[PDB]
Design a protein around this ligand. Sequence first.
Ligand SMILES: *[C@@H]1O[C@H](CO)[C@@H](O[C@@H]2O[C@H](CO)[C@@H](O[C@@H]3O[C@H](CO)[C@@H](O)[C@H](O)[C@@H]3O)[C@H](O)[C@H]2NC(C)=O)[C@H](O)[C@H]1NC(C)=O
Ligand SMILES: *[C@@H]1O[C@H](CO)[C@@H](O[C@@H]2O[C@H](CO)[C@@H](O)[C@H](O)[C@H]2NC(C)=O)[C@H](O)[C@H]1NC(C)=O
Ligand code: CU
Ligand code: CU
Ligand code: CU
Ligand code: CU
Ligand code: F
Length: 497
Amino acid sequence: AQIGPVTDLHITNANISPDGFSRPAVLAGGTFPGPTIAGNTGDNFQITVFNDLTDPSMLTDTSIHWHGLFQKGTNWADGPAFVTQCPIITGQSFDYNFNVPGQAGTFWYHSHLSTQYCDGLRGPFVVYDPNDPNASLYDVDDDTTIITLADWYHTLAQQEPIGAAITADATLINGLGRSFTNTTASPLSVITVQSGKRYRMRLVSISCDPNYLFSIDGHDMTIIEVDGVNSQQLTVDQIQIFAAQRYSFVLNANQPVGNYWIRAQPNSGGQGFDGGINSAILRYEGATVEDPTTTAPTTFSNPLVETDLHPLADLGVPGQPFRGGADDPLVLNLAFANGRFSIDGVSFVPPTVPVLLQILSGAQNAQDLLPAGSVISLPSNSVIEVALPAGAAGGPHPFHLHGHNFAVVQSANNATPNYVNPIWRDTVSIGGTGDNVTIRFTTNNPGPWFLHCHIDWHLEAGFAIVFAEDIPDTASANPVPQAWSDLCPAYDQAHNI
Ligand SMILES: *[C@@H]1O[C@H](CO)[C@@H](O[C@@H]2O[C@H](CO)[C@@H](O[C@@H]3O[C@H](CO)[C@@H](O)[C@H](O)[C@@H]3O)[C@H](O)[C@H]2NC(C)=O)[C@H](O)[C@H]1NC(C)=O
Ligand SMILES: *[C@@H]1O[C@H](CO)[C@@H](O[C@@H]2O[C@H](CO)[C@@H](O)[C@H](O)[C@H]2NC(C)=O)[C@H](O)[C@H]1NC(C)=O
Ligand SMILES: [Cu+2]
Ligand SMILES: [Cu+2]
Ligand SMILES: [Cu+2]
Ligand SMILES: [Cu+2]
Ligand SMILES: [F-]
C-alpha cells in the first residue's frame, strides 16, 4: 500500500539481504526501498517522521528531504541537514508539514544527513494528477508500475575506508538483485503486465552514485515525464538515468506473452548480466514462471539523448537567448583535488547552525553566512543562469537544485544551447570534459536552497553550495513551527555542542 499524504513514518535499523548478503540498514517503513508516499497535486502532506534509530554505525540522527518538491513558504521542511534544519535525534519525531501546489509527477524521499541514504533511507514519492494531460496514454498507473533503481553496498556508508575506491556490490531493481561478486541466485524482482494494456512506468533512480543504462528486452519506452515535468512523447529503447532523476514512460504490453529481461547497467561495479546481476524480469500474465531467454542488442537503436526531450507545455526559457542573457549569470568553477570537491574554491563542510536558522537570526548577507564562501545570495524575481562546466574527477556529475526545477539550456556532450524548448528538470548530468551544461530558473521562492552533486559520496566530500535566495524575504516567507525551533537546541544538547 501507498501511504500519505498524512502518515507516520518510522525510521529504524534492521537487517536486510536484498542480494542474499545480510547487513544492517537504515529503513523507512521497515523496507528497502521505503514505502511509496503519495497524494494528489496540491495536497497537504503531513509526514511525521519518528526517528527510532539506535545503531551509531549508520548514525542515530536523521533528516529527510522530499526531492524535487519546491517547499515554497516551507523551507524549514526541506530536509538537508545544516541547510534547513538540525537533524532529528533518536527517540524524537518531527512533522514535515507542507503542500505541493503546482506540481504533479514522480519524486522520491531520502535521508539528507551525511551518506545515510546509501544505508537504506530512500523511497518513492508520487504526486498524482487527477486531470493528468497524459492520462489517455496508458491504462495502469499505481504502486505496481513504480520501478526503482538502486546501488547497494555491503560495506556500511560510514565505514567506507578513507582513500579506497567506493563501488557498489549489487544493483537492486524494486529492492532485489544479485551481487557482482560471490553471486548467488537470490530472487529477482518481477514486474507483471497484461497483454494488450499500457502502463505508466515511473522509473526512479534512488542511486547514491552510478548512472544506469535502463532497457527492457523486446520493448521500447515512450517518455512522458522528466523529473516531474510533463514531456512530449519521446520513444526510446534505452534510458541513461543519473542519480536522483526520474522518468515516466509508457510501456505497451505488445510483445508475445512471455518473460523479458529488464536491464539496469551501472557505470561502475559489475559489467554485464552474468548470473542475473543488473537484472529484473518483465512477466506477462499467463507466461511460464521461468527466467527470460531474451538478449539485448549489441547497439541500441534509439537511446535517450537529453536534447530530444521537450516540455509538453509551452515552458520556454527565461531570459535572453544567449550566454549570460540573465539578470544573475553565474559560472561555477567545479573542481576536485586530494579527496575533496570544491565550488569556486570552497569545499562544503556543513555548518553548526543551519543556514536557514542563521538567516532567521538576522544574518542578512551571504558574506555573513556560514560556511564562509559556501553561501551565495540570489536576488528575488530575477532570471538566474548557472553554467556548470565539467572536468572534475568522478564524473559524470548529476547536479541538483533544491526548491526549483530549471530549463536545461545546454546538455551533456553537445555544445549547442537551446533557448527555445529545452526540457525542464531538477537533476542534470553536467557531462564530460569541455562540456558546459547550463541551467536557468527564476527566483520566486525565498529561502536557502542546496545546489549539489547527487553522487552522495561527492556531496559528503564537499561538492555543494547553498543559494540563499531572497535573504530579505526569507523570514516573512517561511514562518516556522515551534517543533522546528526546538530541533537545534535538542540536537546540540544531545551532541554536547
Ligand atoms: C544538440 O543540441 C541542439 C540544441 O538542443 C539540437 O538542436 C536542435 O535540433 C533540433 C532537431 O533537429 C532542431 O529542431 C528541428 O527544427 C526544425 C526546423 O529547422 C524542425 O523542422 C524539426 O521538426 C525540428 O523541430 C532545433 O532547431 C535545434 N536547435 C538548435 C538551437 O540548434 C541538436 O539536435 C543536438 N544534437 C544532437 C546530435 O542531438
Ligand atoms: C560556459 O559558458 C559560460 C557563459 O555562460 C562561459 O563564461 C564566460 O567565460 C569567459 C572566460 O572563460 C568570461 O570572459 C565571460 O565573462 C563568461 N561569460 C559569458 C561569455 O557570458 C564559460 O567560459 C563557458 N565555459 C566553458 C568551459 O565552455
Ligand atoms: Cu532535492
Ligand atoms: Cu536529492
Ligand atoms: Cu559528483
Ligand atoms: Cu539534495
Ligand atoms: F529537491
